Design a protein around this ligand. Structure first.
Ligand code: HEM
Ligand code: DAO
Length: 458
């Protein structure tokens, strides 16, 4: 049966670890995928990784009966900061289930619509900031979208205001987070032989984790000092009991999950919006269609919750953005038993399989010779539903199975509302007409050094 898996030749002691660009490891992953195809091997410090780049293999690996999220590589290091909180717990750790069952109802459609008013407030703060600063002020796109997503997440779920639009600098949490995530990846790639030369990076890693724990302590202290009668993520964490186990979250776990949601609940949405606005600006055809949609559906009147599902082109723009720019570009699967995939590839129990979504999402077999182009038309409901029927798991930016994104509907309502609001009131242009998209990677991806200007409409 089984064919040998190719891969870049390793070196003694280091395997292929030192091939990874410190600042943009995703590039290394995708260049190897271009060179060796749908599957290749890496020898890294945490074990032999297999890197799957094709929709055929990604779909098989999305079978929850045969595979599971292991929490390996970078995610395993992220446990240093958030332990067995919802994102970094292993499936056999009872705290995954306790947290899952207690927190799931906060993201039900009823609750998400309930948060629309507060999402709309934070979006308005951003709109007014840009309106008031006028058309000559360069906007640091990722900075203002991080402010929006952090403030939206914290207000709607924890009833906490960072008030990021009142402060020149981002809250210390944001830098601590970026370095904690980057260094978590770096640690998992660091070969035994070299590790001793990283003591400065190590002191800093634990200091940045302390900032995360302190910030979450601050959110929890605010709720204790100013109790509220509303139901939200944090009231669920404090009061919620799991029917199945009869348990509530420990304070240790409340801090773990608060950090988890502060990160997962804003970082990737700031990426989505930052990439989406780069792509709309660069693709004037799509810019016009998205503007034309907002004008016909919403016009100059208020954006209400009903409008979120009445903006199909904006939905398509976000879907297409997440296809080319999945802001978590790799998810991990591991086989529950020794296994064979594409009926020719030997795969060991618990062996780390990297689903390189940044490549699976360009599979020519699914998306054709236009795969690398930005075409929102591609991901309109009719064609999107067709691609999912004919090529299941062709598009997985929100992960897979019982370990898929709990926050998807929050992110979606936020991204659609913000994009509608901004296109309604503003036109957008590159600050540098010669800007070429570069990536900043903190495990997650965003545009780097992307500035634009906002001109109010008439
Ligand atoms: C555009 C925005 C977002 C993207 C692309 C995204 C993507 C993902 C992905 C891929 C996973 C799976 C990780 C894995 O398989 O290892 C995931 C899980 C998760 N996401 Fe999101 N996400 C987004 C927004 C959010 C938001 C807004 C929240 C919370 C309010 C959130 C909370 C989570 C949590 C808690 C998990 C862990 C769930 C579990 O495994 O039990 N994310 N997300
Ligand atoms: C708490 C939220 C953190 C999000 C994790 C994103 C990880 C993707 C990068 C994987 C790279 C690797 O481990 O080789």
């Amino acid at each position: 049966e089984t064919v040998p898996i190719p891969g870049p030749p390793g070196l003694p002691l280091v395997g292929n670890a030192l091939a990874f660009d410190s600042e943009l490891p995703l590039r290394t992953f995708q260049e190897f995928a271009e060179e060796y195809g749908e599957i290749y091997r890496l020898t890294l410090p945490t074990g032999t990784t297999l890197v799957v780049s094709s929709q055929a293999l990604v779909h098989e690996l999305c079978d929850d009966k045969r595979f599971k999220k292991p929490v390996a590589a970078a995610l395993a290091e992220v446990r240093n900061g958030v332990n067995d909180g919802l994102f970094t717990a292993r499936e056999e750790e009872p705290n995954w289930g306790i947290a899952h069952r207690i927190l799931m109802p906060a993201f039900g459609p009823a609750s998400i619509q309930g948060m629309f008013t507060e999402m709309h407030e934070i979006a308005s703060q951003l709109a007014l900031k840009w309106a008031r600063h006028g058309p000559d002020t360069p906007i640091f796109v990722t900075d203002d979208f991080t402010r929006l997503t952090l403030d939206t997440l914290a207000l709607c779920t924890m009833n906490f205001r960072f008030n990021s639009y009142y402060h020149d600098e981002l809250h210390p949490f944001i830098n601590a987070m970026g370095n904690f995530l980057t260094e978590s990846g770096a640690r998992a790639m660091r070969p035994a032989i070299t590790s001793i030369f990283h003591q400065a990076a190590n002191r800093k890693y634990w200091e940045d984790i302390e900032v995360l724990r302190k910030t979450a302590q601050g959110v929890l202290d605010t709720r204790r000092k100013h109790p509220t009668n509303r139901k939200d993520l944090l009231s669920a964490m404090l009061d919620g009991v799991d029917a199945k186990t009869g348990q509530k979250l420990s304070d240790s776990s409340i801090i773990d999950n608060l950090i988890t949601f502060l990160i997962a609940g804003h970082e990737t949405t700031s990426g989505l919006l930052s990439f989406a606005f780069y792509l709309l600006i660069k693709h004037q055809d799509a810019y016009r269609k998205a503007q034309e949609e907002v004008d016909r559906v919403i016009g100059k009147g208020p954006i209400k919750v009903e409008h979120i599902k009445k903006l199909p082109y904006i939905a398509a723009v976000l879907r297409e953005t997440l296809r080319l720019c999945p802001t978590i570009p790799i998810i991990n699967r591991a086989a529950k038993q020794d296994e064979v995939i594409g009926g020719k590839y030997a795969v060991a129990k618990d062996q780390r399989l990297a689903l390189l979504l940044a490549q699976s999402h360009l599979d020519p077999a699914v998306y054709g010779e236009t795969a690398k182009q930005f075409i929102p038309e591609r991901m309109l409901d009719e064609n999107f539903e067709r691609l999912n029927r004919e090529y299941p798991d062709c598009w997985k930016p929100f992960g897979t199975g019982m370990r898929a994104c709990i926050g998807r509907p929050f992110a979606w309502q936020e991204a659609v509302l913000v994009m509608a609001m901004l296109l309604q009131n503003f036109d957008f242009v590159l600050h540098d007409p010669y800007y070429e998209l570069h990536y900043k990677q903190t495990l997650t991806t965003k545009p780097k050094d992307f500035y634009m200007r906002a001109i109010l409409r008439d």
